[PDB]
Amino acid sequence: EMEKEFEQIDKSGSWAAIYQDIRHEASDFPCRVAKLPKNKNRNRYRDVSPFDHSRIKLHQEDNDYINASLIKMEEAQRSYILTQGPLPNTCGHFWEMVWEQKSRGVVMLNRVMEKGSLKCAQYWPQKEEKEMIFEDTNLKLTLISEDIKTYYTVRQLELENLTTQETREILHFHYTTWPDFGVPESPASFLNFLFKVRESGSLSPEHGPVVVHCSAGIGRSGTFCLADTCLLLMDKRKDPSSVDIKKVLLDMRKFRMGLIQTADQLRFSYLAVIEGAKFIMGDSSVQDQWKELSHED
Ligand SMILES: O=C(O)C(=O)Nc1ccccc1C(=O)O
Numbered sequence: 001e002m003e004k005e006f007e008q009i010d011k012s013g014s015w016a017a018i019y020q021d022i023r024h025e026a027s028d029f030p031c032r033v034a035k036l037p038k039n040k041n042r043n044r045y046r047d048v049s050p051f052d053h054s055r056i057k058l059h060q061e062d063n064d065y066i067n068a069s070l071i072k073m074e075e076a077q078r079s080y081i082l083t084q085g086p087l088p089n090t091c092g093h094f095w096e097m098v099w100e101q102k103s104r105g106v107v108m109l110n111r112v113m114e115k116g117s118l119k120c121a122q123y124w125p126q127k128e129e130k131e132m133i134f135e136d137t138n139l140k141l142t143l144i145s146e147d148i149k150t151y152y153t154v155r156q157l158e159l160e161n162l163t164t165q166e167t168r169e170i171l172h173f174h175y176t177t178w179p180d181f182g183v184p185e186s187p188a189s190f191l192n193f194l195f196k197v198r199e200s201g202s203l204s205p206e207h208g209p210v211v212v213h214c215s216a217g218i219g220r221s222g223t224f225c226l227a228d229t230c231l232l233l234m235d236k237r238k239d240p241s242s243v244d245i246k247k248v249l250l251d252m253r254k255f256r257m258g259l260i261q262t263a264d265q266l267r268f269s270y271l272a273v274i275e276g277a278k279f280i281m282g283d284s285s286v287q288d289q290w291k292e293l294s295h296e297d
Contacts, residue, residue: 001240001241002240002241002243002245002270002273002274002277003274005270006270006271006274009267009270010267015263015264015266015267016263018246018263018266019260019262019263019266020263021246022246022249022250022253022260022266025250025253026250026253026257027051027250027253027254029051029052029053029054029254030051030052030053031049031050031051031052031055032052033050033052033055033065034049034050034052034055034065034067035049036065038063038065039063039065041087041089042063042065042066042067042087042089042090042093043067043084044067044084044085044087044215044216045084045216048067048084048216048217048218048257048258049067049257050066050067050068050069050256051069051255051256051257054069054070054071054072054254054255054256055068055069056068056069056070056081056083056097056101058093058096058097058100059096059100060096060137066083066090066093066094066097067083067084067090067217068081068082068083068084068097068211068217069081069082069083069217069255069256070209070255071209071225071252071255071256071259072255073229073232073248073251073252075233075251076229076232076233076236077205077232077236078203078205078228078229078232079209080203080209080210080211080212080225080228081097081101081103081209081210081211081212082212082213082217082218082221082222082225082256082259083097083211083212083213083217084120084213084215084216084217085108085110085112085119085120085121085123085213085214085215085216085217086120086121086123086213087121088121091121091123091132091134092134092135092136092137092139093136093137094123094211095123095134095137095139095141095159096134096137096139097211098159098170098211099137099139099159099161099168101208101209101211102207102208103170103202103207103208103209103210103211104169104170104171104200104201104202104204104207104208104210105170105171105172105173105197105200105201105202105203105207105210105211106124106170106171106172106173106210106211106212106213107173107175107197107202107210107211107212107213107221107224108120108172108173108174108175108213108214109175109178109212109213109214109220109221109223109224110175110178110180110213110214110215110220111176114179114180114215115180119180119214119215120213120214120215124141124143124155124157124172125141125142125143125157126143127143128143131143133162138161138162138163139159139160139161139162140159140160140162141157141158141159141160142157142158143155143156143157144156144157144158144169149296149297150295150296150297151175151176151177151185151189151193151294151295151296152173152174152175152176152177152193152196152296153172153174153176154171154172154173154174154196154200155171155172155174156169156170156171156172157169157170157171157172158170171200171202173193173196173197173202175193175220177189178214178220180214180215180219180220181219181261181262181265182262182264182265183223183264183265183267183268184268186293186294187268187271187272187275187276188275188289188290188293188294189290189293189294190224190227190268190272191227191272191275191276191279191290192290192291192293192294192296194224194227194228194231194272194276195287195290197210198228203228212224212225216258217256218256218257218258218259218260218261219258219260219261219262219265220261220265221259222249222252222256222258222259222260222261222265223260223265223268223269225252225259226245226248226249226252226259226260226269226273227269227272227273227276229248229252230243230245230248230269230273231273231276231277231280233248234273234277234280234281235280238280238281238282240277240280240281243273245269245270245273249266
């Protein structure tokens with residue numbers, strides 16, 4: 001059991017070592033394209049790249065490079081797209097990706113300013129009356145509404161492919177209290193956001209992969225995807241002890257680098273998945289307990 005391992009790691013304070021183990025076992029595959037000189041201004045960190053195998057390719061002819069990776073979880077039957085926070089030059093690539101990959105939702109786990117620095121472009125409209133149009137990829141984008149909570153906001157956006165005048169709705173889920181290189185205020189808070197997401201149809205298979213990003217597309221996003229996939233795995237079986245989290249993390253590792261930046265993030269992931277297991281194991285009343293605790297309003 002994870003509860004047992006948790007309490008054993010925790011007892012001898014070995015989270016750091018465990019985490020180090022992970023970093024050390026993880027897959028290293030090439031990122032040749034990402035390191036092409038024409039893509040310098042496309043990546044936001046020297047050090048966080050999409051592996052070639054798993055990268056998402058734009059359907060442009062010019063340059064198909066986006067810093068984004070499909071994480072495709074086979075056994076859990078759930079894909080996501082992890083990306084960095086769009087640069088001012090790639091905001092139009094980001095929405096082309098969402099257009100082409102056919103995504104329903106975008107989860108933003110970061111604030112555009114964090115820790116004094118601009119972590120991410122303002123890539124969606126913050127108001128009504130003033131849409132965006134990305135000339136380079138021929139897409140228009142409009143705020144339709146938003147539902148501001150204490151720690152997160154759900155936006156409904158309209159995306160049109162101005163070449164065909166096809167339109168689609170995108171749910172944006174913005175977690176605004178997950179500190180960069182940190183963990184959320186509590187498991188109840190995280191699991192309450194996670195389930196807003198789920199409820200909404202975004203992570204469902206009639207749709208393309210949910211786009212998940214923070215600033216880099218690795219710490220925060222890996223942290224999210226990890227809990228989700230672990231809950232989904234236990235869900236099919238109703239068998240928690242078939243879930244190995246560190247092994248799950250290593251399957252994601254194969255598809256994007258750096259998924260989960262710290263050992264407290266790892267630790268938080270066990271907390272999240274052990275708590276949510278309540279709900280997967282038929283106590284559906286915990287889901288509103290999460291909402292109380294959460295102070296969503
Ligand atoms: O945005 C995150 O959550 C994350 O993974 N961040 C980062 C990861 C790698 C390098 C830099 C950052 C950063 O934001 O400075």
